[PDB]
A and B are shown apart, each in its own frame.
Chain A
Amino acid sequence: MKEGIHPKLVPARIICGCGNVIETYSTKPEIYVEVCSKCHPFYTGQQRFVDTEGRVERFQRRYGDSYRK
């Protein structure tokens, strides 16, 4: 590469708030992230968040059935 024009790359440590640590290279030797590959919902299998729904709507109300036959 040309001298004088490029940001030098140093070995970097990138820490995610889930304690995950990733040995890489970067312009900064230490960056802290809030998400990563190890704790992302789409990554951690399904890790279906609060949307474990079933919907549950709406016939799955069943809130009743008391009405006569």
Chain B
Amino acid sequence: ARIAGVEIPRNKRVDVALTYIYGIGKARAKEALEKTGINPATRVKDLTEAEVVRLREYVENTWKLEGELRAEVAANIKRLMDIGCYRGLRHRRGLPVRGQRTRTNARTRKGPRKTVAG
């Protein structure tokens, strides 16, 4: 549990390894390194704890992450479901939420096919 509670891969670069935390893309990768002056191309195997504890201090303090982001979004859908919004409706039944078609695909959200008789 190195940074933000998640050990980040070594033998890789810092900007690509920061992505391996839930809550950081290429953007916040590029950001936290510039905004802390840490070479984005360093092997994680070659970082003194100065860069480490500085980078971690930025990353944990700046953005809502790992469990916080997961718990926050968990309340979000829950809230839509509670009130009875359409997006909450379609979160109860596990269907599309952003208005896709359902007659055919939706298999990412409706899981594997459940072939019936017909």
A residues near B (Cβ < 8 Å) are: 17, 32, 34, 49-51
Contacts and interface: CB of A to CB of B under 8 A. Distances in A.
Contacts of B56: 17, 34
Interface in B57-76: 57, 60-64, 68, 72
Say whether chain A's binding surface is mostly helix, strand, loop, or mixed. loop
A34 B2 contact: yes
Closest 8 CB pairs of A and B: A17-B53, A50-B64, A51-B64, A34-B56, A50-B63, A51-B68, A17-B49, A49-B61
Interface residues of B, number: 15
Interface of B: 1-3, 49, 52-53, 56-57, 60-64, 68, 72
A50 B52 CA distance: 21
Contacts of A32: 49
